[PDB]
Amino acid sequence: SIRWKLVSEMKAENIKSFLRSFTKLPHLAGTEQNFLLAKKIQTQWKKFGLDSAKLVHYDVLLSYPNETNANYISIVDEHETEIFKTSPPPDGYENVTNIVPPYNAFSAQGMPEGDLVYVNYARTEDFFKLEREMGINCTGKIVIARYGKIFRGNKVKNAMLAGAIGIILYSDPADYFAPEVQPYPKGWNLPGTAAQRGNVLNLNGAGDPLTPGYPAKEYTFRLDVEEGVGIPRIPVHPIGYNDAEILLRYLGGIAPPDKSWKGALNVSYSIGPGFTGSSFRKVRMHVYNINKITRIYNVVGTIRGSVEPDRYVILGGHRDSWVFGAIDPTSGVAVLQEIARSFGKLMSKGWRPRRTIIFASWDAEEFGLLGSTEWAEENVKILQERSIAYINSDSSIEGNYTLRVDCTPLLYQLVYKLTKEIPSPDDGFESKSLYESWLEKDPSPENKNLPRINKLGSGSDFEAYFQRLGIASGRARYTKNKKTDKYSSYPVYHTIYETFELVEKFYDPTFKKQLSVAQLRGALVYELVDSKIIPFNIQDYAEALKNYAASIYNLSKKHDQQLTDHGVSFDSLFSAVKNFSEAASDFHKRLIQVDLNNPIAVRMMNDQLMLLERAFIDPLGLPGKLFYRHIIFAPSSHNKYAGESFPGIYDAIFDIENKANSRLAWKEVKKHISIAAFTIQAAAGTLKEV
Amino acid sequence: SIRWKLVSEMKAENIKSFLRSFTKLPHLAGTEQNFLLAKKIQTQWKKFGLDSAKLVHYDVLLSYPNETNANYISIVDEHETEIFKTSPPPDGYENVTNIVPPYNAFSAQGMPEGDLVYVNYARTEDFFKLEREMGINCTGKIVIARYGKIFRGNKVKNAMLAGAIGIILYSDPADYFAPEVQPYPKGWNLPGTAAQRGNVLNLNGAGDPLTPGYPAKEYTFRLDVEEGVGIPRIPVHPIGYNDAEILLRYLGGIAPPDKSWKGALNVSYSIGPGFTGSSFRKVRMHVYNINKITRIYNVVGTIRGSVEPDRYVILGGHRDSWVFGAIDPTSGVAVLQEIARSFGKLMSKGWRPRRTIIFASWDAEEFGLLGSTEWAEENVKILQERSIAYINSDSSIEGNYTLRVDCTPLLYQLVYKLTKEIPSPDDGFESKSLYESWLEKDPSPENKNLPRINKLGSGSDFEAYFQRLGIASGRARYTKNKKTDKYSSYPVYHTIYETFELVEKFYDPTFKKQLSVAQLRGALVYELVDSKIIPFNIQDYAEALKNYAASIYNLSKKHDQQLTDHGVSFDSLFSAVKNFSEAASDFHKRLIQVDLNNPIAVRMMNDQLMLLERAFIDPLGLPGKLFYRHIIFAPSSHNKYAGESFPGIYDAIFDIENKANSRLAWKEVKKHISIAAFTIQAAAGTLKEV
Numbered sequence A, B: 001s002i003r004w005k006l007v008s009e010m011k012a013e014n015i016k017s018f019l020r021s022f023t024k025l026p027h028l029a030g031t032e033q034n035f036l037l038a039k040k041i042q043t044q045w046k047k048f049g050l051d052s053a054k055l056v057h058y059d060v061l062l063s064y065p066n067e068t069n070a071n072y073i074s075i076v077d078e079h080e081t082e083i084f085k086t087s088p089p090p091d092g093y094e095n096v097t098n099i100v101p102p103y104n105a106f107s108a109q110g111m112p113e114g115d116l117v118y119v120n121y122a123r124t125e126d127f128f129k130l131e132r133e134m135g136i137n138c139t140g141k142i143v144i145a146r147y148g149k150i151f152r153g154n155k156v157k158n159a160m161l162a163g164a165i166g167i168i169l170y171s172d173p174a175d176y177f178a179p180e181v182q183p184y185p186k187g188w189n190l191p192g193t194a195a196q197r198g199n200v201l202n203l204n205g206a207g208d209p210l211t212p213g214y215p216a217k218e219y220t221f222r223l224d225v226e227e228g229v230g231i232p233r234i235p236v237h238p239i240g241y242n243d244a245e246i247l248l249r250y251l252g253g254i255a256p257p258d259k260s261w262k263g264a265l266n267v268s269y270s271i272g273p274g275f276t277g278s279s280f281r282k283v284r285m286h287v288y289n290i291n292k293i294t295r296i297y298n299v300v301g302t303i304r305g306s307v308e309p310d311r312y313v314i315l316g317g318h319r320d321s322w323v324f325g326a327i328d329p330t331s332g333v334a335v336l337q338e339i340a341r342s343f344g345k346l347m348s349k350g351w352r353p354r355r356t357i358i359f360a361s362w363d364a365e366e367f368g369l370l371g372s373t374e375w376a377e378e379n380v381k382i383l384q385e386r387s388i389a390y391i392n393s394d395s396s397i398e399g400n401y402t403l404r405v406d407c408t409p410l411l412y413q414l415v416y417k418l419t420k421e422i423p424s425p426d427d428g429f430e431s432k433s434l435y436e437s438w439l440e441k442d443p444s445p446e447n448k449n450l451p452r453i454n455k456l457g458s459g460s461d462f463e464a465y466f467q468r469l470g471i472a473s474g475r476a477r478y479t480k481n482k483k484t485d486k487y488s489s490y491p492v493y494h495t496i497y498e499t500f501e502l503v504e505k506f507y508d509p510t511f512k513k514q515l516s517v518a519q520l521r522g523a524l525v526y527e528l529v530d531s532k533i534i535p536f537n538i539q540d541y542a543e544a545l546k547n548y549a550a551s552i553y554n555l556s557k558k559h560d561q562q563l564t565d566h567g568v569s570f571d572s573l574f575s576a577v578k579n580f581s582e583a584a585s586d587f588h589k590r591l592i593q594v595d596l597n598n599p600i601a602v603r604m605m606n607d608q609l610m611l612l613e614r615a616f617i618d619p620l621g622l623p624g625k626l627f628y629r630h631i632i633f634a635p636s637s638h639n640k641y642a643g644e645s646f647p648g649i650y651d652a653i654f655d656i657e658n659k660a661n662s663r664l665a666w667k668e669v670k671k672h673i674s675i676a677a678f679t680i681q682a683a684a685g686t687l688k689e690v
């Protein structure tokens, strides 16, 4: 088959060669090297035989350290004397000059000074525990939080809400140092001198902070920088664990409340505020990063469909990194090139797809999904009426245990089908499929005989396509074993030590695991773009809605008396879900009857398949979040990396027992139950024959 | 042709018989008689042979007088003694019991007392003149305004902003008494005892006040009534001119400022506050209408398409009236029945349309477009992806001089084409077409060789379809001669005197003018639903955008120094308009080349024609107005009946010289210029081939 030709043409050695070629120098967004990498990708797509390959630019707010006013944290004594201050490229890269020092992009500027408080992971539950159980008031304090568990911008939002005047982020070995592995370069663990870069915005889907809603073109209106969406109002800076140990060692005050607050350093993990047993009197931060409008460049290419050129499947991945980014994103950049090359080989033998493929290399993803979101804002009118699906191509290889897939229920069946026809790259599975190894290693909690597929929140460039525009989206990559590996992300994430050599020595020396991910991403694009009937299954969406309705109802049971007292009922939601299940079953019964030789009959049913995900989009958005529009899924308000189901109801019920005004609070729950019931009923209505 | 069979089957005598049958009794929304009229329309559509005809209900907030606490206005002396108080069915209707007394639906309740001020038509410019030129402060006053010029809800919003505590509305003979015509029943003029009913909400497109965004179903969340959208916060009541003359006669204070403030009554038109020359000391209002959730019923029917059943042309008109409503809306109800009957006659000979026709009889239009807007909110997901156009069928006969058409530029060419093939009903034009008489009587200001077509604002049930959803819309009716007839609406508008006998004796005894309107509305539906290529012209939209851009730029010239000082430029708007004109020309050049025997080629271009109007819809809405989403048109903020072009820019520049903060004000102008330029460029992008 053509799909087998596409998959079998892809080669591990080619992914390895692309990865080495793209990882020799840092390629930070807005810098000359990441522009040169765009032009290189463009040249390659033209050689492969794509119909077009263009650079598409935007001018967006970025953030960088000031070379002549360096950031630091210090400890001062009562006489204002600095007692301590926080502070080469990896082997082989000694001549690389322009590695950006560690910083958190979009931190406020300032020099706050105060007592230090340790706040664990700075999650919502950690600040609840501090205030409600531990007697700690963070107002006016500098807080120190360990990285991990949730997106760092959520930590900063939480510290702002708790009244902190600054937040120090650090990498604790409990979370970034795998047991019995040596630090880089001898092993793949994080050294104590390395800090994790990353932005600390709270954009909620907005894209460029200065141009929410509209693409950042040269004529475009810009908000004043002080009103930029999502920009934090306190300083934020990241440090490695050698420096963190010095800051934590003499913290006094209360003992850590339980073992879940204690990391792995040889310190007490006492909470503060203040020091004991030391010259250590106050902590200071000094953070002076600069925000500036900077040009970014997406590469956008196409293969135009031969039958339905006005229908799109998008394969997009980011190219910008914090330093070399050999895993994030460049492993995905290398995969995207190998998929485009393979589609080019098909074209060289006369094939053309039924629908149009759009290939995209996004810029400034690490600064808030900026390039992919600005392009979605520019092209929203054609994208929302014509797109079948978005397949991401970020990091392919964050661990070497098994596959991880996150996607809409519409795509579950296609994912399972395609993984059965891709050889497993895993040791011990040499005559078995990827589906077989994935099922053995990560069975789904809700059905032991299927592999786990996760919900979509945010974290990568599919966000605007799925959460704002309602385009079916999916992602797949290799990952760690969650039952034995307790570290967050991977140890060297967003450090200088994400090098080609790390990937080849420690993650995937044969490049077979990366190859399996390229084969799956490419095969998904192929089936979505070439199949006469779009390969979605809406009965799988109906089953998912039944599970999500049971989950949100279960989370309401502990408030049963309040539900009765305030007249709150989930009956309309369960009725809408029942009606959707009936409509989805009836739709599939009619779909198998379609006359495949009648092009308008086929197109009308394909439009229903394409527009189903769109029915879940509410133009009014979610509360406070104009740009999260999907009623079934949104990024969690507590952790943008995680997807939450029925987000409007979930947020309305969360911590409701502590709301000041219970009558108002329960009316908000009733509002969002009503919106969810309407939206699912409306979606069911789009499937009806008459 | 089939179109000629549709048009020629329609008969004046049938429109007359329908109108007589629907106008014997009042048919106020939410009352038993208007439900009985729905079931009658349903029975008729089934007899005609429609595929379906269903009642679709919603429970929405309506407003009615309290039978046991009647409304009134009084004049009291300084001893609190009532000196004056404001206060049968038409001939032939003496036994009709349930005529609703005059009131303004959704008025606040209250009994304010104070000095009286005359505020002319209570337009924005009248309140500017009062405050800025005449030295009058309306704070704490009862104001009296004449009806006319603008929607009455705008008068009430303006009086609230000026600080009034109540507003009396009245019909001045200057505006509702045509010269040398006798009052009803001897002629068609307004008697001095009659008052005009009508709602006084400021909904801005929201629909039911309690359920903005979502259809008002039985499970639906409802706002608390005190938070209902658009509900005024002062009492409002309407009176006839015999009563108004008594209230105006002894007003003292300043003389009317110029003749444009003087109506036709034998009173001075002095402004107040206060009385002179009289026992007349203070005015009181007493208004106690009740707001209550009430069931309403739309009738929705279909003829399913034979080729593209998933594409819709909607023909909708309201059925509810204030009293008998023989003009508004029942002349349009009679027309809609005659069009449905004629389509049924086509079906009886074996015809079926290419696309689907949706017929709708809307309820509660007179209470804020409620039935049509709730149905749009219920069906938004299918409507926005599948609708070709909306054709209204409200009043057909508001005067007897010539045609009036209001529609999107997409429909100009079709309107002109069809009017050339409909016989003119006008005396003296017996061998000429309707186009010929319309052109002679109402030439367009921008092209003397075409009839005038107006922009769409609000005022009838097309509003949500066009302004919220971006579905091409049009309306047509017979109207008065504006160059000789200076009265607003028609004299008996919204009174008990809108009777069948009024229409037959004074407006259109032969029913030929009503017939010509039925023929045009039906022919528009037919061509939109049956033509292989949707009959829109996008180069006419390009020309319209050039005119609107020149108009908004011209309105900015008096601020030229401020444009320079604040760095405001219209360059991006003119560049987007140029790019749209090029894209529209290129689209039409490709459209004539389409292979008409290739169904997917045809469908792809029809999708571009259908989705063009949608490209102008911004889900973020206009400032303060979530439900007006069209960037090119919106109802005027000063008069919802009028359409305004580039509404976001217009409102940003309006009265800008009086804004407190000029830097902020000009930044808002720049924002809305940027949004308009983006939106037109995005719309141009939807026409591109690649």
Ligand SMILES: *[C@@H]1O[C@H](CO)[C@@H](O[C@@H]2O[C@H](CO)[C@@H](O)[C@H](O)[C@H]2NC(C)=O)[C@H](O)[C@H]1NC(C)=O
Pocket (backbone or CB within 6 Å): A572, A573, A575, A576, A579, A677, A678, A681, B217, B218, B219
């Ligand atoms: C699911 O579909 C059913 C059947 O159409 C809807 O049930 C109606 O519910 C209303 C109250 O909302 C009752 O007045 C009707 O009598 C019901 N008809 C039946 C049971 O045949 C139900 O409303 C739909 N669910 C939603 C959320 O729209």
Ligand SMILES: *[C@@H]1O[C@H](CO)[C@@H](O[C@@H]2O[C@H](CO)[C@@H](O)[C@H](O)[C@H]2NC(C)=O)[C@H](O)[C@H]1NC(C)=O
Pocket (backbone or CB within 6 Å): A217, A218, A219, B572, B573, B575, B576, B579, B677, B678, B681
């Ligand atoms: C209309 O189309 C033109 C041509 O594509 C656009 O012109 C570009 O304008 C930008 C500044 O916005 C310049 O950087 C380019 O050099 C222009 N290219 C030309 C003139 O070939 C113009 O931006 C479009 N208008 C809008 C509103 O998008």
Ligand SMILES: N[C@@H](CCP(=O)(O)C[C@@H](CCC(=O)O)C(=O)O)C(=O)O
Pocket (backbone or CB within 6 Å): A198, A199, A328, A365, A366, A367, A368, A369, A394, A458, A459, A460, A489, A640, A641
């Ligand atoms: N592991 C995460 C993050 C991958 P990422 O590319 O590194 C994204 C980047 C920006 C996110 C944002 O601004 O919203 C960040 O998390 O710092 C995932 O896969 O989902």
Ligand SMILES: N[C@@H](CCP(=O)(O)C[C@@H](CCC(=O)O)C(=O)O)C(=O)O
Pocket (backbone or CB within 6 Å): B198, B199, B328, B365, B366, B367, B368, B369, B394, B458, B459, B460, B489, B640, B641
């Ligand atoms: N002459 C006007 C009004 C016709 P209408 O049907 O009477 C509408 C009705 C309700 C309007 C509203 O609530 O927005 C009103 O104006 O009071 C027109 O044609 O456009």
Ligand SMILES: *[C@@H]1O[C@H](CO)[C@@H](O)[C@H](O)[C@H]1NC(C)=O
Pocket (backbone or CB within 6 Å): A066, A067, A068, A069, A290
């Ligand atoms: C960088 O810091 C130096 C020293 O404070 C300052 O003079 C300079 O203005 C800064 N650069 C920017 C772009 O703010």
Ligand SMILES: *[C@@H]1O[C@H](CO)[C@@H](O)[C@H](O)[C@H]1NC(C)=O
Pocket (backbone or CB within 6 Å): A131, A137, A138, A139, A140
């Ligand atoms: C938090 O501490 C600050 C100290 O300035 C104080 O204003 C506030 O009342 C305290 N709140 C709680 C819950 O202790």
Ligand SMILES: *[C@@H]1O[C@H](CO)[C@@H](O)[C@H](O)[C@H]1NC(C)=O
Pocket (backbone or CB within 6 Å): A188, A399, A400, A506, A507, A508
């Ligand atoms: C890669 O897999 C090998 C073999 O199972 C294992 O020893 C190594 O730890 C894995 N690497 C990482 C980075 O997990």
Ligand SMILES: *[C@@H]1O[C@H](CO)[C@@H](O)[C@H](O)[C@H]1NC(C)=O
Pocket (backbone or CB within 6 Å): B066, B067, B068, B069, B290
């Ligand atoms: C009508 O007015 C009477 C007299 O004030 C009052 O008792 C009654 O409650 C009113 N009806 C409603 C529905 O408010």
Ligand SMILES: *[C@@H]1O[C@H](CO)[C@@H](O)[C@H](O)[C@H]1NC(C)=O
Pocket (backbone or CB within 6 Å): B131, B137, B138, B139, B140
């Ligand atoms: C309007 O009159 C009221 C009288 O109470 C007063 O509060 C306000 O200052 C006056 N404003 C103007 C512009 O005269």
Ligand SMILES: *[C@@H]1O[C@H](CO)[C@@H](O)[C@H](O)[C@H]1NC(C)=O
Pocket (backbone or CB within 6 Å): B188, B399, B400, B506, B507, B508
């Ligand atoms: C109807 O037309 C006749 C003949 O021109 C005219 O005398 C009469 O005033 C018109 N009626 C109205 C209501 O305008």
Ligand SMILES: [Ca+2]
Pocket (backbone or CB within 6 Å): A206, A207, A208, A210, A211, A212, A213, A214, A215, A216, A374, A377
């Ligand atoms: Ca933007």
Ligand SMILES: [Ca+2]
Pocket (backbone or CB within 6 Å): B206, B207, B208, B210, B211, B212, B213, B214, B215, B216, B374, B377
């Ligand atoms: Ca509603």
Ligand SMILES: [Cl-]
Pocket (backbone or CB within 6 Å): A332, A392, A393, A394, A395, A460, A475, A476, A477
């Ligand atoms: Cl990915």
Ligand SMILES: [Cl-]
Pocket (backbone or CB within 6 Å): B332, B392, B393, B394, B395, B460, B475, B476, B477
């Ligand atoms: Cl109309």
Ligand SMILES: [Zn+2]
Pocket (backbone or CB within 6 Å): A328, A366, A494
């Ligand atoms: Zn990253």
Ligand SMILES: [Zn+2]
Pocket (backbone or CB within 6 Å): A318, A328, A329, A365, A394, A395, A460
């Ligand atoms: Zn990434």
